[PDB]
C-alpha cells in the first residue's frame, strides 16, 4: 500500500528553475529512488537515481550538470532540483522505486511508480483556445454518415478536454493528441461520425475546457449553409 | 550509458497469437534486464525482473530470457490486455530504457473514409485559415496524405495527428491540417487532400472550392 506522490511541476521559462518533490509513504527507509520522465508521445528516459543513504547518485548525460538529485530519509522525500531548463525537458516526470535482485537466488523486487508531475518549459504564455466549427457538408458526408468537429486552436499550455453534447455522445468520437505549432501553442481537433439524416434533426455541441486559462467554450456545429 | 535497441519497432498480431520482442545492448548488461509494460495515460508496470523472473501477478504467458547482449520477451498467446508499449531496461550500469516496442492488434485491411473541411468563416474573420482532412477508421496505420492547392503540391504547411488504436474495431483515425495565412488562402480556389492507402483501389482525392456551400 506504499505510494509515491510528486509535486512541484508546472510552467516555467527556459533557463529558469523548478524543483520537484517525491514523498513516499511514511518514514529512514531502505530503498533507492529514481527520476524517470516521458516527453509527449515519446518513450521513457531515466533521469537520475540516488541510493538509500544518498551515498551514490547518477544522472543521464542529457541533464548532467543542470539537475541535482537529493533525498531525506527522515521525511522520506526525494528531490529533483532542476536548473538551466530547456524546452526539451518538457515531459511528465515520474518518481519510482526500482529494486530487483536474485542474490543467493532469493527473489526480491519492489517496483512502485508515482503518477507523475508535468513540466512545461517554454517562453509562451497562458492563452485560451479558439474553438471553430468543422461544419458537415457534402464533402464531410459519405453514404449515410457525415463527419463534424471542432478545431481547438492556439492554446497554451496543456491539457484541454473535449466532450460532445455534455458527454451524451461518445460513439464515433475522436479527439486527437494536441499538435505544437511553430508559434509554441497547441491545436487539436475533435471529430465525430454521425448519421447524415440527423444533421437536420440533431444538435451537436462540442464542449472544450482549458483549465490553465479557465476557458469554458460550448460551440454548436451546424451544416454549412449558403 | 548502455544503449538498448528494441525490435520490432511495431509488432502487429492477433489475440491468441504469440509475440517475440527483442532488445539488444551495446555492451553486456549481465542478467540485470527488466521488462515494463505501459498503456496510454498510465505509469509503466514491471513484468519481468532479472531477465526471467515475473513480478507478482504477472500471467505465466509472459516469459523472459537472454544473457549479456541479446534478450527476448515472449508472450505465449496474447490477451487483449497485452497490446501496449514494452520497454526493456538495464540496471548493470545505472539505468537505461530502450526506445520501446509497440504491440498492435493485427486486423484485415480497412480503407479510410476521407473528409475535407473548409476553414470556418469565424476562423477566417479571426485572421487564420485551417484546412482539415480526416481519415477515419482505417488500417493499416501507414497512410500518405497529400495537400494540393489548385494542383500545386504543398510542403511544410501541413501537420498530422493520429489517434490510438480503437478498442472495438482496432482501426486508426488521422487528421492532416493545412495551416495557411488567410491572405494566401483567399487567393486560391481548389483545395484537395489526396489520400493513398493500402485499402484503396486508387488514390482518393477529396476537394472543395473556396466559397462553396
Amino acid at each position: 500500500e506504499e505510494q509515491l506522490v510528486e509535486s512541484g511541476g508546472g510552467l516555467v521559462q527556459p533557463g529558469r528553475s523548478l524543483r520537484l518533490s517525491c514523498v513516499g509513504s511514511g518514514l529512514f527507509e531502505e530503498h533507492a529512488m529514481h527520476w524517470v520522465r516521458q516527453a509527449p508521445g515519446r518513450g521513457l528516459e531515466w533521469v537520475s537515481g540516488i541510493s538509500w543513504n544518498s551515498g551514490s547518485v547518477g544522472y543521464a548525460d542529457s541533464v548532467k550538470g543542470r539537475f541535482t538529485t537529493s533525498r531525506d530519509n527522515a521525511k522520506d522525500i526525494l528531490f529533483l532540483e532542476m536548473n538551466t531548463l530547456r524546452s526539451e525537458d518538457t515531459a511528465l516526470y515520474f518518481c519510482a522505486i526500482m529494486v530487483a535482485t536474485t542474490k543467493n537466488d532469493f527473489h526480491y523486487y519492489k517496483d512502485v511508480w508515482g503518477k507523475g508531475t508535468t513540466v512545461t518549459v517554454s517562453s509562451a504564455s497562458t492563452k485560451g483556445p479558439s474553438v471553430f466549427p468543422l461544419a458537415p457538408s457534402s464533402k464531410s458526408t459519405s453514404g449515410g454518415t457525415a463527419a463534424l468537429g471542432c478545431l481547438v486552436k492556439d492554446y497554451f499550455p496543456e491539457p484541454v478536454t473535449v466532450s460532445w453534447n455534455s458527454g451524451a455522445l461518445t460513439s464515433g468520437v475522436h479527439t486527437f493528441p494536441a499538435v505544437l505549432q511553430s508559434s509554441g501553442l497547441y491545436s487539436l481537433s475533435s471529430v465525430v461520425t454521425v448519421p447524415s439524416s440527423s444533421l437536420g434533426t440533431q444538435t451537436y455541441i462540442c464542449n472544450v475546457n482549458h483549465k490553465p486559462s479557465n476557458t469554458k467554450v460550448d460551440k454548436k456545429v451546424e451544416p454549412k449553409s449558403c | 550509458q548502455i544503449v538498448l535497441t528494441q525490435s520490432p519497432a511495431t509488432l502487429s498480431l492477433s489475440p491468441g497469437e504469440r509475440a517475440t520482442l527483442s532488445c539488444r545492448a551495446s555492451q553486456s548488461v549481465s542478467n540485470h534486464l527488466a521488462w515494463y509494460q505501459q498503456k496510454p495515460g498510465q505509469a509503466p508496470r514491471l513484468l519481468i525482473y532479472e531477465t526471467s523472473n515475473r513480478a507478482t501477478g504477472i500471467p505465466p504467458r509472459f516469459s523472459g530470457s537472454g544473457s549479456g547482449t541479446d534478450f527476448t520477451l515472449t508472450i505465449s498467446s496474447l490477451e487483449p490486455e497485452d497490446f501496449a508499449v514494452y520497454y526493456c531496461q538495464q540496471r548493470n550500469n545505472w539505468y537505461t530504457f530502450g526506445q520501446g516496442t509497440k504491440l498492435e492488434i493485427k486486423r484485415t485491411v480497412a480503407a479510410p473514409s476521407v473528409f475535407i473541411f473548409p476553414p470556418s468563416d469565424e476562423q477566417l474573420k479571426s485572421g487564420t485559415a485551417s484546412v482539415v482532412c480526416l481519415l477515419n477508421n482505417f488500417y493499416p496505420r501507414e497512410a500518405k496524405v497529400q495537400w494540393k492547392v489548385d494542383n500545386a503540391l504543398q510542403s511544410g504547411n501541413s501537420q498530422e495527428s493520429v489517434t490510438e488504436q480503437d478498442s472495438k474495431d482496432s482501426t486508426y483515425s488521422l487528421s492532416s491540417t493545412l495551416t495557411l495565412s488567410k491572405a494566401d488562402y483567399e487567393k486560391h480556389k481548389v483545395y484537395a487532400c489526396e489520400v493513398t492507402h493500402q485499402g484503396l483501389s486508387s488514390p482518393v482525392t477529396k476537394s472543395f472550392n473556396r466559397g462553396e456551400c
Binding site: 541510493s51 551514490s56 529494486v99 530487483a100 535482485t101 542474490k103 | 540496471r91
Partner: peptide
C-alpha cells in the same frame, strides 16, 4: 562508480 549491489538489495 555504479554498483548494482548499492541500488538493489533486500532491506
Amino acid at each position: 562508480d555504479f554498483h548494482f549491489e548499492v541500488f538493489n538489495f533486500v532491506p
